[PDB]
Amino acid sequence: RIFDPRGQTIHQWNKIFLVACLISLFVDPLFFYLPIVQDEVCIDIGIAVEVFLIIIRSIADVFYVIHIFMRFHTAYVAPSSRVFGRGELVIDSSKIASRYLHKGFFLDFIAALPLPQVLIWIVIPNLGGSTIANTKNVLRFIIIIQYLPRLFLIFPLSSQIVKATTAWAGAAYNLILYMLASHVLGACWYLLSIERQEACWKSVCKLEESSCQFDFFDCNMVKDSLRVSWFVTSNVTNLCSPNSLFYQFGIYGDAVTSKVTTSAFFNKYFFCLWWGLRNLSSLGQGLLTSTFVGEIMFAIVIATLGLVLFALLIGNMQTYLQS
Amino acid sequence: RIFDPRGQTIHQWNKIFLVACLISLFVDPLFFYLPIVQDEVCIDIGIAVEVFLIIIRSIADVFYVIHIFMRFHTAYVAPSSRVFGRGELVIDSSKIASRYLHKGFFLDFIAALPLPQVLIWIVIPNLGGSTIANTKNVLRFIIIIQYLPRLFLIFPLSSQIVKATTAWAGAAYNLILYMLASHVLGACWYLLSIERQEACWKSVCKLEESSCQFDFFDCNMVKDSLRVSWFVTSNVTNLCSPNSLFYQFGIYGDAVTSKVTTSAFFNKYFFCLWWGLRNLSSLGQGLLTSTFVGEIMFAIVIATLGLVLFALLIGNMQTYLQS
Amino acid sequence: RIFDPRGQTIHQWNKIFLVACLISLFVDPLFFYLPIVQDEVCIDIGIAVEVFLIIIRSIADVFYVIHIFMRFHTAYVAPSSRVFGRGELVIDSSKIASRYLHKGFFLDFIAALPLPQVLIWIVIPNLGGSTIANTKNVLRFIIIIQYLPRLFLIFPLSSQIVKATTAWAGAAYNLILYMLASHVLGACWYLLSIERQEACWKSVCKLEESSCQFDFFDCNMVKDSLRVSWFVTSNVTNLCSPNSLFYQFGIYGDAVTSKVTTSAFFNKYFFCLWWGLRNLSSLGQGLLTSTFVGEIMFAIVIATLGLVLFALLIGNMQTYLQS
Amino acid sequence: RIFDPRGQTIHQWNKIFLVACLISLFVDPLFFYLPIVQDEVCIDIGIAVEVFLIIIRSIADVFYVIHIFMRFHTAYVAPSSRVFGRGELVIDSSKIASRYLHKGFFLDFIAALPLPQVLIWIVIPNLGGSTIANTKNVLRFIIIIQYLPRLFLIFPLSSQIVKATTAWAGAAYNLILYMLASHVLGACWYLLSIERQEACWKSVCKLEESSCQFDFFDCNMVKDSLRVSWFVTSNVTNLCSPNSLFYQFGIYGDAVTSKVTTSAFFNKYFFCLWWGLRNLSSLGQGLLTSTFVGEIMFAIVIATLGLVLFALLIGNMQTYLQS
């Protein structure tokens, strides 16, 4: 059942797979919005939203597995058989599999690994208790390690769609990509702000090591008598604010003053998407960072992305107007 | 009395209609500047300015009715008779009316409906008392529901004018588009800031529900003894300020600190026009919103409009310089 | 002694006239830096800098008069005698004078009028004592009335210089124009901030009509016994500051906090030039104006100039790299 | 042993020399990050990082000397022997040396001088004790005096590499130049902020001439009894802050508020790099300077560099899109 590379089944499958990849690209950064900072100073996770996102990601991974299957069952054109553009067809399944494994299979398999799901379920909780690591909100960012190759996969595939079927197709696509970059940067900023607030809490606990340890900032122990007794005699709610000059919050300060980390899922999502869009359009200006290397590099990445994306938008609109 | 589409009567009518549509597009957002926040914490409406705007709107409406009447009596080129461009003319009134009804009549009829003057006069006040809704200043935005179709009519019609009559007509036209977009965004910002201040007043009333009720911020009840007795012992004047953290004013806070909602019509109009133009040139930067989805979406729309308009301006200037 | 329009004497005269026009365009805005706000809350005029600028403007006006004389004594090509480019020359002095008077003489004569000199010397002081008007700092802006036609003369003449003698000639020329716009806008902003501070002083005087009148803010009367007695008991020092919420300084408030109205000529000049450059590059963003129509219109003009200039710069660099 | 100008040895040497020159351009501004402001209000020099930078710069200068020595022994195409491209080879060493001395030797020699390490070792300390000058942290900027000619050598030489080896070579090259400009501007801003804080300390000492001289702000005298006695009774810590309105810190105040001058080398380097990149992308907006001419000139230079770099980047991206 080898499908023709320039046939109809593969064209329809690629049309569906572009939508599936776009859905996966949209859903992956949403995993960064799960942590919630509560008024009692603790980080919880929205269970219902977590399960919903995991279900969507599982559907996307099923689609990716189907794509890998169809790529093991697709034909190719031999480079040496290209007779005036007529490269014929190859039906050898073994040759197709060898060609796929030599080039293309590795990156597609990496992109199809259910990394967020295993990280959420069978890595952090249950037997894989990372008490020694104590970086539950940091490991989520390794999704980016898988997100970056997957983002690459959107470039050639969509190009094939361009071959499948203009003036309006150069600016709308670039604005969609620009919104995607804004979405990813906003989710990254939200998770980094959560990490910054957790670091401020850890510094406060270090200042108050007499009656605190690095276990009081989890909402599963908020009702403990020790937790409330420490909370009523601590000024963590006032020290961990951008107004107080105790900890350098930097660009993450807007996540504490505006209570973004406490707001509902849609409020926080739209706030962070607008943050990313605004700091991508403004070329990273207004990102008055602290003296921390990671935040500075995040701001530099945002500025560079804004520069290249604005240049692409200007060029695309110039091309559209000239044609 | 069928008019020639390429003739002189229709050309002159289109020249008049371009100016009429430009005036109508300039006047429609001005209805958002009518509400006035007075020093007694209430929202009034300038009766004289409202009457003048309704008169101008009715003039635009009768011009649109004349345009519809004229288009009911215009000839069209038969697609099947296009013999090397010479498509002749169709004179049959019934055929012309049927063709116009099939394509074109609905969208032109929508743009000619006197929706704003109906809403102001015979929808909200008098028989149609919307006491339950209590959203008098929110219904105005449904003018946008009609504004967007009308904004469409400029693009073809002006192009037709281009056919009727370059290097200087590309940058100036896009600057006019920029002015119109900034004016509309400024009017929308003014009305949304009025809504935000009214929402803060409603929150204060809820906090003081013992002596306040949800009909109490109307200027027709200012002289009431109950209202003054409540006001002399109420802290609504400082709770609904961006300085206080009682309510998240966000980007609308600049309309409370600067007191544009209480200024004269020209001052408020120019302030809001400059606000829209500045946040369109800054690509939405400086729009530090709150965690409210509507305000965030407004900021995102402003940033996207700034992106597309600046890209169009750069492309038009590049075309001008290359020509 | 009619000179050849395609000859060498007129070529050299145009080369030196471009320099003279550039110097005159650089010098006219400097007259806006003359008023100085002193620590005694008064506005004085720097006599030495004023005299130097008047001398430079006199030299420029002499050059302009020589230019208009030479234009009265230059030949022209008859439009009806253009036989395949060989349009011959016209030597009749009467015909040349009539042609110049019909078109060209009016605006050239307008630019050659010593308006700033007569305004400074024989309009405001001496016989023309503007005691009733009391707007000495406002009249200077009618230099702009002469400045706008003069700025016109740069555009054709420079093009003629192009005909006298590339890839590098597009970016540098546009940067020179951009610097000129920044210089003019900075001088205008300095004078407007002077006017705003004087208006705040007048408002304070109105608040203190018992012991103040509209002369007390003139530095010639600073040593008056009434002046010192009012000053030792007046709070105009802190009331007219952007920190206090007494007067809406707006975008001009930055000139009071930084004390640029008091500093030396070089400091204030460079601060205002950088202000114009920054608010021209930032597309007018950060110009958070008050509810005053004049300030808002000035900010709108600055933003539109920034838009057109940045688009022109982008287009010029695109042309330079492409060619 | 004259090398062929279009041979293989010179090609490889130029490939090495481009990397060497890039290293030298990256290392020279790092000398500006050496001064450190300590909590005892004094400026020290990191000896270890200074020695490492001196060693790297010495290696780069040895590479420059090797380049000069070898290009003394290369043939050149005779201007009069260019017979249809075949310009032959000049083997005469005397003629090659004469041509090099006439054109090429001066700029290559001035760019190979060990001026930075000479200043660090045998100019400022030891015999050349600049007690009278008292500009230990100011002289470093004369590295820029040699840096600009060395910045020139990149533009031709890199072009040769282009001749030795596209669509991706326009955006990447522009971004490399842009990052280099950001790095240089950040180093210059750090050293200028150090200078501003030192000037504030000098002003404070002038305010405290009774018990202070211009030596208490050197970290070699921090442990002196007079030093500690003055420090315990001096308020230099409060007066020399951006919050206190004592000294106009201007755009350098962000360096004191963020305590970047005290941070470690990596923190300060990345903070200053992000500062330069942000103020270069923002076209100098947000550089609210003081009334000081040097700071204003620095801001104007930053704005002009941002303008030209953004224009070049837009043009390069347009070229990439169209080709």
Numbering used by the authors:
A (entry chain D), B (entry chain C), C (entry chain B), D (entry chain A): 58 to 222, 228 to 385
Published text:
The transmembrane domains (TM) and CPD of the MtCNGC15b show contrasting features in the density map. The well-resolved EM density of TMs enabled the unambiguous assignment of residues 58-385 from MtCNGC15b. Similar to other CNG channels, the transmembrane domains of MtCNGC15b can be divided into the voltage sensing domain (VSD, S1–S4), the pore domain (PD, S5–S6), and the selectivity filter (SF). The ion conduction pathway of MtCNGC15b consists of the selectivity filter (SF) in pore loops and the inner gate formed by S6. The SF of MtCNGC15b comprises residues Ser344-Gln347. The side chains of Gln347 restrict the permeation path, differing from a glutamic acid in reported animal CNG ion channels like TAX-4 and human CNGA1. Substitution of Gln347 to Glu abolished the Ca2+ currents, suggesting the indispensable role of Gln347 in Ca2+ recognition. Different from animal CNG channels, three pairs of disulfide bonds — Cys99/Cys281, Cys262/Cys302, and Cys267/Cys274 on MtCNGC15b is mapped to the nuclear envelop lumen side. Notably, the Cys99/Cys281 pair forms a bridge between the VSD and the PD of MtCNGC15b. Given that the lumenal environment is likely oxidative, these disulfide bonds may play a physiological role in regulating the coupling between the VSD and PD. Mutation of Cys99 and Cys281 to Ser drastically reduced Ca2+ currents without altering the localization of MtCNGC15b in the plasma membrane, while mutations in the other two cysteine pairs also led to compromised activity.
Cyclic nucleotide-gated ion channels (CNGCs) in plants mediate Ca2+ influx in response to environmental changes. Among numerous plant CNGCs, Medicago truncatula CNGC15a/b/c (MtCNGC15) is localized to the nuclear envelope. The MtCNGC15 was reported to be activated after the sensing of Nod factors and negatively regulated by camodulin (CaM) to fullfil a cycle of Ca2+ release and retrieve between the endoplasmic reticulum/nuclear envelop lumen and the nucleoplasm. Here, we report the structures of MtCNGC15b in the absence or presence of CaM.
